Amino acid sequence: AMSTQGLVQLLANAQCHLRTSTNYNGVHTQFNSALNYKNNGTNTIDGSEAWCSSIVDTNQYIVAGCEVPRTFMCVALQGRGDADQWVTSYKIRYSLDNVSWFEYRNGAAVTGVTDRNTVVNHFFDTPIRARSIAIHPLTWNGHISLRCEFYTQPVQSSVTQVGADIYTGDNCALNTGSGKREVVVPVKFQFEFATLPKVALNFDQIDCTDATNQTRIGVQPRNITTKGFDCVFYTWNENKVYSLRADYIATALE
Amino acid sequence: STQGLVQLLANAQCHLRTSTNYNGVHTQFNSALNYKNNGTNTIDGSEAWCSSIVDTNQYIVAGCEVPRTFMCVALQGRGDADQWVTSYKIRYSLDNVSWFEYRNGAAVTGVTDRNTVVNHFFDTPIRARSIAIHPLTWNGHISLRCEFYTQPVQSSVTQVGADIYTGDNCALNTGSGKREVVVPVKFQFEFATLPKVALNFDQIDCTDATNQTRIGVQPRNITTKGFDCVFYTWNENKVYSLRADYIATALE
Amino acid sequence: MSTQGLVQLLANAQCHLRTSTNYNGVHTQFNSALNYKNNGTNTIDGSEAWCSSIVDTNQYIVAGCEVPRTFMCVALQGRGDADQWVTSYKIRYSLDNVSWFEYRNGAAVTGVTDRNTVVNHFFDTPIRARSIAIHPLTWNGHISLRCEFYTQPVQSSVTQVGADIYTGDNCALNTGSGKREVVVPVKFQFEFATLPKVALNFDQIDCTDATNQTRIGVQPRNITTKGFDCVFYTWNENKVYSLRADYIATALE
Ligand SMILES: *[C@@]1(O[C@H]2[C@@H](O)[C@@H](CO)O[C@@H](O)[C@@H]2NC(C)=O)O[C@H](CO)[C@H](O)[C@H](O)[C@H]1O
Ligand SMILES: *[C@@]1(O[C@H]2[C@@H](O)[C@@H](CO)O[C@@H](O)[C@@H]2NC(C)=O)O[C@H](CO)[C@H](O)[C@H](O)[C@H]1O
Ligand SMILES: *[C@@]1(O[C@H]2[C@@H](O)[C@@H](CO)O[C@@H](O)[C@@H]2NC(C)=O)O[C@H](CO)[C@H](O)[C@H](O)[C@H]1O
Numbered sequence: 001a002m003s004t005q006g007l008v009q010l011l012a013n014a015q016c017h018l019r020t021s022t023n024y025n026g027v028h029t030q031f032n033s034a035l036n037y038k039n040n041g042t043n044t045i046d047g048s049e050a051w052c053s054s055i056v057d058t059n060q061y062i063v064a065g066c067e068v069p070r071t072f073m074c075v076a077l078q079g080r081g082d083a084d085q086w087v088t089s090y091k092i093r094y095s096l097d098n099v100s101w102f103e104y105r106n107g108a109a110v111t112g113v114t115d116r117n118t119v120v121n122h123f124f125d126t127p128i129r130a131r132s133i134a135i136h137p138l139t140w141n142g143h144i145s146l147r148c149e150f151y152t153q154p155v156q157s158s159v160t161q162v163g164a165d166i167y168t169g170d171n172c173a174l175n176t177g178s179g180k181r182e183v184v185v186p187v188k189f190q191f192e193f194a195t196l197p198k199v200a201l202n203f204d205q206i207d208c209t210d211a212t213n214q215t216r217i218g219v220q221p222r223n224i225t226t227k228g229f230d231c232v233f234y235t236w237n238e239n240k241v242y243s244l245r246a247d248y249i250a251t252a253l254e
Numbered sequence: 255s256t257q258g259l260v261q262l263l264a265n266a267q268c269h270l271r272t273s274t275n276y277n278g279v280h281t282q283f284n285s286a287l288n289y290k291n292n293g294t295n296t297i298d299g300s301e302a303w304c305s306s307i308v309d310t311n312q313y314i315v316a317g318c319e320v321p322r323t324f325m326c327v328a329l330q331g332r333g334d335a336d337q338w339v340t341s342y343k344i345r346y347s348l349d350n351v352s353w354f355e356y357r358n359g360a361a362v363t364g365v366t367d368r369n370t371v372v373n374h375f376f377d378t379p380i381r382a383r384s385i386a387i388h389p390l391t392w393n394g395h396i397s398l399r400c401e402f403y404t405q406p407v408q409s410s411v412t413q414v415g416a417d418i419y420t421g422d423n424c425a426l427n428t429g430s431g432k433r434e435v436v437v438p439v440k441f442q443f444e445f446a447t448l449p450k451v452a453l454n455f456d457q458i459d460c461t462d463a464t465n466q467t468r469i470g471v472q473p474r475n476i477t478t479k480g481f482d483c484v485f486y487t488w489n490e491n492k493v494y495s496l497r498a499d500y501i502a503t504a505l506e
Numbered sequence: 507m508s509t510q511g512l513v514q515l516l517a518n519a520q521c522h523l524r525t526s527t528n529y530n531g532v533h534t535q536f537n538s539a540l541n542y543k544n545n546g547t548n549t550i551d552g553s554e555a556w557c558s559s560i561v562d563t564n565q566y567i568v569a570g571c572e573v574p575r576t577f578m579c580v581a582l583q584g585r586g587d588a589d590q591w592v593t594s595y596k597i598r599y600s601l602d603n604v605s606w607f608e609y610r611n612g613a614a615v616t617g618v619t620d621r622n623t624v625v626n627h628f629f630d631t632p633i634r635a636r637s638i639a640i641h642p643l644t645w646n647g648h649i650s651l652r653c654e655f656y657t658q659p660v661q662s663s664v665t666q667v668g669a670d671i672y673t674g675d676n677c678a679l680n681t682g683s684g685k686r687e688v689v690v691p692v693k694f695q696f697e698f699a700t701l702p703k704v705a706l707n708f709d710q711i712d713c714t715d716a717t718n719q720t721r722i723g724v725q726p727r728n729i730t731t732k733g734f735d736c737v738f739y740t741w742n743e744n745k746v747y748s749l750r751a752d753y754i755a756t757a758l759e
């Protein structure tokens with residue numbers, strides 16, 4: 001437990017779809033596959049403390065599929081809780097683009113378990129960047145029966161909106177006067193962010209007069225909310241600015 | 255009351271993991287709100303997810319890889335027998351490492367019959383990836399149908415491209431009037447939908463014209479594959495070079 | 507080869523599968539993947555298909571993806587172990603998971619005529635959606651199928667914006683001549699999973715021309731997953747009092 005501290009337990013957190021090659025029956029399915037899964041020991045009808053295949057050969061597998069790429073640090077294997085069935089060695093295969101698949105260690109066997117309940121962790125030689133990952137049992141005791149977990153680095157999710165060409169107008173109010181002067185253009189995002197975004201807001205067109213050879217121009221967001229922000233174009237000192245244009249990039253996390 | 259919200263289970267937007275299943279026809283396959291099955295055949299099981307162990311340690315977990323704002327959870331009893339959950343607690347996780355309890359684990363009111371849906375709108379919407387219903391009290395058995403209602407999500411894909419350049423002493427450095435130098439840009443991969451493009455200066459080398467600076471950069475002919483980076487000046491200005499970075503984002 | 511280069515969604519476990527009904531617990535969506543085959547010597551593992559419990563025109567299997575996909579093709583296949591198959595169906599889909607639509611306004615699409623011969627349907631126009639559903643309309647024997655959806659590959663990006671990286675007032679660019687720089691180290695709020703690309707552009711400029719010439723620049727150097735150095739610079743005889751920039755850093759896959 002300490003050895004995978006701070007990592008995401010994929011199956012525990014229901015972060016992946018699980019597809020199996022075959023299921024012994026309807027109470028031996030991938031619904032029973034989570035590490036340390038335990039069921040009703042007094043009632044036989046809820047089935048096995050494991051996913052168990054129907055066909056017993058070297059062509060079986062369980063696939064965990066994530067739509068968002070992850071960095072897989074480790075796979076834990078465990079035997080069947082309620083009978084002497086466990087997987088003693090297996091192959092790992094994975095895919096990042098879900099078109100081409102690859103074999104970990106070129107398909108060499110990874111060491112599995114030797115009993116019902118003692119978990120055996122395997123940390124991948126190099127962390128594997130993938131969307132989908134599969135356990136392919138190669139050798140077994142009794143039957144192809146397992147519980148398992150995959151451990152990944154935490155993911156971060158961003159949502160970004162770009163908006164183009166926020167403009168002061170021609171011969172705008174920055175083109176007269178002196179001292180600090182601002183022209184404000186309210187901007188509404190196309191959709192409302194779920195959390196407060198950070199906003200980059202940068203020049204794409206500049207039409208301005210120097211003042212004793214000095215250029216002084218700026219643009220900055222103000223009053224950023226989930227819905228929009230005020231685009232503040234500005235100059236200062238004696239500078240006269242005919243126009244300014246900017247594009248923005250707004251990004252919220254998680 | 256849930257108009258405009260995404261019905262997660264109905265839309266197959268989440269994986270469902272349960273603590274235990276009574277048997278193979280009482281599983282989370284049967285868990286969607288208003289799920290109804292063959293009333294003339296017993297073999298397809300319950301109009302509910304039903305646990306195998308009946309205690310206060312059961313749960314159904316719904317997992318989303320894309321974070322959601324959970325507005326409401328709806329509970330419903332079992333359609334075909336007098337089994338329902340009378341109260342429950344809610345637990346959730348945003349990062350799938352640390353979990354939290356809604357209301358510090360206090361009970362939320364469930365249902366009182368087979369079919370009448372009881373909506374619970376969270377005191378404050380919950381930002382999370384995974385969410386779990388933990389039954390605390392029940393009538394007859396731990397048996398339920400449910401739904402989670404979230405705000406619609408948006409998905410963006412962004413490509414950054416660096417250092418699109420006019421070249422030194424470019425064509426904008428001679429002549430009068432509106433003048434343009436066009437640099438075609440191809441995105442590293444083709445977007446699925448039409449992107450919007452921010453394209454902004456990172457290097458400027460230009461001459462003033464009667465003290466005026468006039469410079470611009472703008473995309474033209476944006477497609478899913480790329481765009482034309484148009485560097486320009488106008489009037490009498492002479493521009494030796496311009497450089498820009500772009501940010502292209504496509505939605506949905 | 508017609509689907510060369512496309513993602514096989516179910517085979518890659520890229521979707522959740524919900525069904526209207528399942529005949530029993532060994533005829534579920536666990537058995538729905540194109541070319542799914544099971545133990546032909548043991549009855550207990552059920553059908554080489556998803557099979558409904560109710561036989562009417564109201565059944566369906568829904569495939570849901572959280573990340574939007576461009577659906578190119580749906581492949582239908584009958585039941586491997588009995589003479590049951592879906593001869594026509596409609597396709598429904600949703601992009602936002604609030605409003606649903608029907609392909610061809612709900613007209614039938616041609617299904618299969620036997621147990622095993624796959625019939626591909628390439629959509630008239632590719633469908634942009636999160637969730638998609640096969641709704642059997644006519645069948646032989648029973649509503650029993652295997653299927654696949656084929657999507658364009660997806661790309662996933664993560665972006666961080668940081669604002670207002672600044673030289674300071676009256677910075678080192680404001681004296682001297684030749685190539686001169688001011689370096690401001692930047693640390694990303696979180697570490698990216700893969701190496702980002704960085705856009706870094708001006709939002710505030712305070713500078714003196716040199717014989718009517720403006721010369722200013724800003725560029726990232728030493729980009730890592732953790733951050734970068736923001737290099738503000740000028741050259742020739744220009745004196746630059748200050749420069750400010752915002753950054754956008756994006757990592758792929
Ligand atoms: C500061 O304004 C000063 C600089 O622009 C300086 C450049 O040589 O010119 C002084 O005359 C300017 N002072 C005034 C009062 O106009 O500019 C920096 C940005 O570079 C900050 O914005 C300061 O707030 C402002 O005083
Ligand atoms: C417009 O061009 C005018 C401005 O640059 C103005 C600044 O004082 O100088 C006038 O000579 C310029 N007119 C011409 C014909 O060069 O600039 C704006 C952008 O600021 C638009 O591009 C207008 O279309 C253009 O006329
Ligand atoms: C190049 O520098 C030249 C330009 O700034 C030019 C503008 O008229 O003026 C020359 O005096 C400059 N040469 C020197 C040695 O300062 O500018 C480009 C970017 O535009 C590159 O940085 C070149 O490396 C540089 O020589």
Ligand SMILES: [Ca+2]
Pocket residue numbers: 164165204246247451452453471472473
């Ligand atoms: Ca622009």
Ligand SMILES: [Ca+2]
Pocket residue numbers: 416417456498499704705706724725726
């Ligand atoms: Ca750059």
Ligand SMILES: [Ca+2]
Pocket residue numbers: 199200201219220221669670709751752
């Ligand atoms: Ca800024």
